[PDB]
Design an enzyme around this catalytic site. Structure first.
Site, PDB file in Angstrom:
ATOM      1  N   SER B  52       0.752  -1.216  -0.074  1.00  0.00           N
ATOM      2  CA  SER B  52      -0.017  -0.072  -0.056  1.00  0.00           C
ATOM      3  C   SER B  52       0.788   1.245   0.088  1.00  0.00           C
ATOM      4  O   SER B  52       0.204   2.313  -0.424  1.00  0.00           O
ATOM      5  CB  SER B  52      -1.337   0.016   1.077  1.00  0.00           C
ATOM      6  OG  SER B  52      -2.041  -1.029   0.746  1.00  0.00           O
ATOM      7  N   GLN B  85      -4.506  -3.364  15.799  1.00  0.00           N
ATOM      8  CA  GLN B  85      -4.273  -1.792  15.799  1.00  0.00           C
ATOM      9  C   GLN B  85      -3.695  -1.518  17.048  1.00  0.00           C
ATOM     10  O   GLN B  85      -2.731  -0.697  17.229  1.00  0.00           O
ATOM     11  CB  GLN B  85      -6.024  -1.195  16.299  1.00  0.00           C
ATOM     12  CG  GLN B  85      -6.363  -1.180  14.531  1.00  0.00           C
ATOM     13  CD  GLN B  85      -7.802  -0.452  14.607  1.00  0.00           C
ATOM     14  OE1 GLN B  85      -8.263   0.146  15.925  1.00  0.00           O
ATOM     15  NE2 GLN B  85      -8.611  -0.067  13.729  1.00  0.00           N
ATOM     16  N   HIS B 107     -14.124   2.277  13.405  1.00  0.00           N
ATOM     17  CA  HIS B 107     -14.462   0.874  14.185  1.00  0.00           C
ATOM     18  C   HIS B 107     -14.011   1.354  15.735  1.00  0.00           C
ATOM     19  O   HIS B 107     -12.793   1.547  15.854  1.00  0.00           O
ATOM     20  CB  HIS B 107     -14.202  -0.226  13.575  1.00  0.00           C
ATOM     21  CG  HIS B 107     -14.957  -0.692  12.288  1.00  0.00           C
ATOM     22  ND1 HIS B 107     -14.381  -0.371  11.013  1.00  0.00           N
ATOM     23  CD2 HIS B 107     -16.150  -0.916  12.193  1.00  0.00           C
ATOM     24  CE1 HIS B 107     -15.159  -1.199  10.310  1.00  0.00           C
ATOM     25  NE2 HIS B 107     -16.155  -1.242  10.843  1.00  0.00           N
TER      26      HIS B 107
END
Ligand SMILES: NC(=O)c1ccc[n+]([C@@H]2O[C@H](COP(=O)([O-])OP(=O)(O)OC[C@H]3O[C@@H](n4cnc5c(N)ncnc54)[C@H](OP(=O)(O)O)[C@@H]3O)[C@@H](O)[C@H]2O)c1
Ligand SMILES: NC(=O)c1ccc[n+]([C@@H]2O[C@H](COP(=O)([O-])OP(=O)(O)OC[C@H]3O[C@@H](n4cnc5c(N)ncnc54)[C@H](OP(=O)(O)O)[C@@H]3O)[C@@H](O)[C@H]2O)c1
Ligand SMILES: NC(=O)c1ccc[n+]([C@@H]2O[C@H](COP(=O)([O-])OP(=O)(O)OC[C@H]3O[C@@H](n4cnc5c(N)ncnc54)[C@H](OP(=O)(O)O)[C@@H]3O)[C@@H](O)[C@H]2O)c1
Ligand SMILES: NC(=O)c1ccc[n+]([C@@H]2O[C@H](COP(=O)([O-])OP(=O)(O)OC[C@H]3O[C@@H](n4cnc5c(N)ncnc54)[C@H](OP(=O)(O)O)[C@@H]3O)[C@@H](O)[C@H]2O)c1
Ligand SMILES: NC(=O)c1ccc[n+]([C@@H]2O[C@H](COP(=O)([O-])OP(=O)(O)OC[C@H]3O[C@@H](n4cnc5c(N)ncnc54)[C@H](OP(=O)(O)O)[C@@H]3O)[C@@H](O)[C@H]2O)c1
Ligand SMILES: [Cl-]
Ligand SMILES: [Cl-]
Ligand SMILES: [Cl-]
Ligand SMILES: [Cl-]
Ligand SMILES: [Cl-]
Ligand SMILES: [Cl-]
Ligand SMILES: [Cl-]
Ligand SMILES: [Cl-]
Ligand SMILES: [Cl-]
Ligand SMILES: [Cl-]
Ligand SMILES: [Cl-]
Ligand SMILES: [Cl-]
Ligand SMILES: [Cl-]
Ligand SMILES: [Cl-]
Ligand SMILES: [Cl-]
Lengths: 327, 327, 327, 327, 327
Positions: B52, B85, B107
């Site tokens: 990414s 996370q 979230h």
């Protein structure tokens, strides 16, 4: 199924190849010595700060570090406990791999459950004897061997099966016969057998029969004989002659008694739970549970061990085995 | 409930502020591009050793390291999987935080279950679109947006809600309408929906209907059509017109059949188990189980995946989708 | 199974034949226009005292009375609701039949359950698209079509299958692929799908999840999102990529949650009742019940409709769909 | 059982020995100060980067690092939470141990479950007061002490019991009486008590009675009084005079009511589950579960905490305790 | 609810009124002395042929016969056991009543169940401290008091509430706070508390935990500690700081253990039986049973007493309390 024997296999794929046996337990020692004695080029990779390091040297093996062995060899045979294979692999084996090498096991637990993911271009095979290291070595010393299993999980280079059959030919399994199955089939049936029948099943069976007699006022010594000690006789008969051979070799009273009462001990509930035990192995729940056992410090496992050692059947069997001279 | 639209929100709180979007998945990419295209100052923090990283550069973003982005920005928007996370936060984000900064998510799983504890003086908000990244970006390109959710978990500085509404205004959610809920309510209802109905519920429903037909001798192809393929038609009708609109748009035979047989499929036992599934989410038992799944190597999860891929419904749907040209 | 495409079919059997489409609903209109646009000779038989009579004229069809159309045509395609087909057939179609004609349907309900018994020397075929009339027409306008089903129940004249494939070639189903099944298989799997999963199953599933959240104190708006609105996303993924494609396109938390909780929602009781629902369809008990529903004035069906319209999930979905702009 | 008092014990084994108290919680502080005040040579090993480090200095203790204290002392008394003892031990204590030293605890949880394995030649003892640190210190200030427990798990050097009794003599437990039990017996009965009766049992009992009254329309304030507040009165009577003394000190209506209704509240199901709770403690399943709770981030535990704090009984008790002046 | 304190109450309604306290038990003595010490005019009516008659004289009270006291006083406070109040009232109190007098209790059992029916024109109030007589008197000696309850069952004269608050002001309850409830609410919640939780509930809980340990081979002494003795610690924490305060003041192992096992001890069956216990109190079945117990000679109650005194937990607690110096 289809069996491979000596006439069916050669050492062509293992001939000019270095085989690293990682581990010097019962299987580590027996398999390493056999292949070396069969003409194969063997090095034994171990921890420098370990006990087996010195034993492997006493036997005349080229003893190396696990990284040293992984680097030198084209074939890395991993015979260490499943519950630490993954950590030892990803740190001290995976970096020294290259396209063309082969990853070999005697147990498909780590490959099958993703704890060991091989690099691209690397063969994944299994060379699995169906007898303990002591017998593996002993039968090989006597010109025979022990029945084994062979598997191919990844055929990167093309001679994966031949490499595994070559290793099986050097271990001596080929003299007795080698069967080709899958990593998943070896793993699942192995876990199910040990849990439902081979280790779990029979010990709970022996406990229940022994505890039934003892709670009924029967002598613990006599209870041990008729629920544990004598069992070896029956198994040896089944091992050699099968069920029909066993029934013919026991008294008709024992035969009639066994055939009419046995469906009452293994009830439908036992068979329904055997199906759940299998599904828990299939879907990876047992592997998860066993992994978390080690991660959490094996407290549950060590408590069960202590409880097992405190059993009456243990104390009575020790006294009887002491008298016999077995222990 | 109470809805925020464009006329109800401004960019005052996000105007002179740097927003770091951590992650370039579907939501990472869609949300980052929208806010940049809305005039907001965006940097994208990623791993240098990642895929990414290069894609985010191809789109013209100021691409930074996660630590680099955390340091530069006043607002850190974390769009990476919940199960990593916490580790990424406590190592590469928490140290570069200061009083006045804002922590933002799509979230609330990690905040709600204590896997991410913010430092004193730091805002905790949520900017949660209710559509996939692809639609988020697409609708925004077309002058419209997608319905979203906004939440304030900690209002340290005073403009936490405005910061979150400003981000929602830049993502484009405000054009369709934004609802203010809580981190706990978003989390619990999200987990319950995916487990009881959205992913778990319906796939088991489709499996049971398909397996019922197939075991009764019906063609697997025909079974796939009437238990899977056709379902999209009904959902799209409910999605657009609700239940009453769907029933009116189907045949009276299908309507009568559905209204009289459906209480027999979702029985009281299903509803009692839905309550336990919710309580397991509420009291954190599911979070514990999901965390231990990753810690133990995802063996259970990978076995289930393999089993799911071996389903007959998969093989038949692939052939039918192949003929259709869908796959 | 075996698929028929364009290269596999011709218009030889329908070429010099007049096709009457009885009915101008979604399927009546879409199928009639497609066949006419494909070069086939079409007349549309309707009630003079009806609404569709004038719409069918607006589209340029030769509009006739049902008796007038039955008399003129060699092929009578009946696209009216199953619950009145039998009465319309025995009064206004059966008398105008002759040896050599063909009876065609998109649904085998009436033939299969004996509500329509064809005269000797008359073909009974099925031309069944697997998509709604709107899509049937739309895809055909775009040079593609929609997957369909073909069946032969009675081959009196010899070209029954060719007549049905010719009609499927004119409707455009052949461009996407046509499957040959049986009137019984189409009927039974269609009734089972709509009842157990497609309409009944999923709405009860959505009701239970929604009612679980709401009774637990969760916001009705949030409950609608996570038990209804979002579901379209998952189905569309299954529709296009299958189960495995869906699981890969959702979060790992949603995947793990779905795979471990879903067997708890569709329990064994649900699967046992699915078998009874199928047997009630097989042995004609459902058909009897649906027939008596109409005969008794649809009081049960209209009460259920009113109750469905009074649901909380309806009122909340209407407000949310109103905000979205969906409704 | 057999009790040790002051006349039964001496400081001979602790006289010329340095005792390190690891930890300055309630027990850390109370026990350290008592032994110092009894003439024993005490150092307190703590984390430099901690709060208790400065408090232990304010009290005039020789404050050291945990490694510094482990090295200096012959006796290491570990009073830190069980769930981090193992990690602190294997890193900062085990290396500074030598033959002849003694390992001492107030809780046998870590020794018993294998989380702390002592080196060869090291004594393992327990000095466990049966009262909170505040009372331990207070009673010792007043010339009396608090009843305690003593245990010997490993007697390497020969004066393990005397070392533990010497420590108990300095803490002051010997003035009230010291009982010799085993590490396993202290651990298992402690875990069972807290879970089945002391903490778990009674709070669920109080919840059920309170929720019964409240759901029946009784005032929450009155319900708190008769299901929680008043309970202290009864326990204090049992604590001082036993069951028979309590029944005599309450009204005959309360006595008759209690004796005839109480078997209905703790049913056979409660007693069967108490046996499973004990077996889960015995075989280490609870220890495994508690360990994995910490390893997984205490999400389950923190959710339960939040739910407990949201109870109605909490809000009503706070208002009543506020009026009383208790809180 | 609404609380009355000192600033909220006066002695206006009790000022020029004579208060007869019938009974010199713990509450008789404490309440009588407090009101006298508060300036109120008190006489104590007792049996001439009784023990308390001479004790009440030793304390300097105007000691009278129950009839003598009933005649002289305007307010008759009855503090004798509920199971003989009715007989003493209808014989020696009711005849000496007149319009304007007030009937006062600390327990509403006899009024509520019709065993005492007041004459027309007579107030019925309750002055109920929520602590034992010893504490009632002690706190009053120290310038504080104990929380109490006040009730008005019949307001004949108009100052019934003021009379009861005046008595509560003289007893000292007003200093801590007085709550106004109803005779029915005090009675029902008092009976339910003592039966389901305060006396019955907890003793059966302690019995079950103790008997679980003992039957498992654990030392009775250790079992008493972890299922009885230690409980006082937890209750005192709940009494002072509530549930949340207790959990924070215990070890995390004890907290996790309690929160995860406690729902298993108080099962649904316990909660269903708590509802029946309440309904038996509500509909008067328990009162009937308790009345017939006394009428039949308390044989059932005395047998239960003997059985309670023969418990192992009694004998072990006596030895432990003997060592401690508690007993
Ligand atoms: C038959 O014995 P068994 O296989 O069941 O059990 P085991 O004796 O505990 O292990 C068998 C072999 O694996 C090695 N091994 C075990 N754990 C290891 C680790 N973490 N890293 C490297 N080598 C390791 C042992 O070497 P060591 O002698 O070094 O333990 C030994 O040679
Ligand atoms: C849609 O995709 P998805 O969000 O569901 O899944 P995903 O593609 O696996 O993750 C989405 C984003 O999170 C990043 N990410 C994942 N794990 C990470 C880690 N441990 N540290 C830092 N960044 C990490 C990915 O970056 P990478 O491209 O570096 O993985 C990617 O940009
Ligand atoms: C999509 O619509 P749908 O098929 O589900 O429902 P529908 O609109 O009620 O019926 C579809 C077609 O069937 C016709 N039809 C219905 N009942 C009929 C009857 N008793 N006799 C003759 N024609 C009849 C309708 O004509 P009409 O317009 O005359 O009702 C219409 O063209
Ligand atoms: C009464 O209190 P409690 O015992 O229940 O709880 P606690 O206050 O959290 O711990 C009691 C004692 O243990 C120490 N401690 C806790 N975790 C530690 C760790 N990981 N390493 C070293 N020392 C640690 C604390 O020192 P600190 O003050 O350094 O936390 C404190 O002196
Ligand atoms: C605290 O003690 P407790 O209240 O629970 O019990 P209790 O001592 O048996 O009775 C408390 C008071 O009630 C009196 N009392 C009991 N039965 C009585 C009767 N039948 N007639 C008149 N007075 C009676 C007692 O007087 P006596 O001293 O005369 O029994 C005593 O002053
Ligand atoms: Cl040898
Ligand atoms: Cl024979
Ligand atoms: Cl089964
Ligand atoms: Cl784009
Ligand atoms: Cl209708
Ligand atoms: Cl329930
Ligand atoms: Cl058109
Ligand atoms: Cl993954
Ligand atoms: Cl069945
Ligand atoms: Cl002090
Ligand atoms: Cl008595
Ligand atoms: Cl049992
Ligand atoms: Cl006094
Ligand atoms: Cl904590
Ligand atoms: Cl009930």
């Amino acid at each position: 199924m289809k069996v491979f024997y000596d006439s069916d296999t050669t050492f062509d794929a293992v001939k000019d190849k270095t085989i690293a046996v990682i581990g010097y337990g019962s299987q580590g020692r027996a398999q390493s010595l056999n292949m070396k004695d069969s003409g194969l080029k063997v090095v034994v990779g171990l921890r420098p700060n370990g006990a087996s390091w010195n034993k492997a040297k006493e036997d005349g093996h080229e003893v190396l570090s696990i990284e040293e062995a992984a680097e030198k060899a084209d074939i890395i045979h991993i015979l260490i406990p499943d519950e630490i294979q993954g950590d030892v692999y990803n740190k001290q084996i995976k970096p020294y791999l290259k396209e063309g090498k082969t990853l070999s096991f005697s147990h498909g637990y780590n490959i099958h459950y993703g704890y060991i993911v091989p690099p691209e271009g690397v063969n994944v095979v299994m060379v699995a004897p169906k007898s303990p290291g002591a017998m593996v070595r002993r039968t090989y010393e006597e010109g025979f061997g022990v029945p084994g299993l062979v598997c191919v999980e990844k055929d990167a280079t093309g001679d994966a099966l031949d490499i595994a059959l070559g290793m099986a030919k050097g271990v001596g399994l080929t003299r007795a016969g080698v069967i080709q199955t899958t990593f998943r089939e070896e793993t699942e049936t192995d876990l199910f057998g040990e849990q439902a029948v081979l280790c779990g099943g029979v010990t709970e069976l022996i406990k229940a029969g022994f505890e039934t007699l003892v709670e009924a006022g029967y002598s613990p010594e006599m209870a041990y004989f008729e629920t544990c000690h004598e069992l070896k006789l029956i198994i040896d008969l089944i091992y050699q002659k099968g069920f029909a051979g066993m029934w013919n070799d026991v008294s008709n009273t024992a035969e009639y008694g066994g055939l009419t009462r046995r469906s009452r001990v293994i009830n439908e509930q036992s068979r329904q739970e055997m199906r759940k035990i299998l599904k828990e192995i299939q879907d990876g729940r047992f592997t998860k549970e066993w992994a978390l056992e080690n991660i959490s410090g094996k407290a549950h496992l060590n408590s069960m061990r202590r409880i097992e050692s405190e059993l009456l059947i243990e104390e009575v069997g020790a006294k009887l085995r002491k008298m016999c001279g077995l222990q």
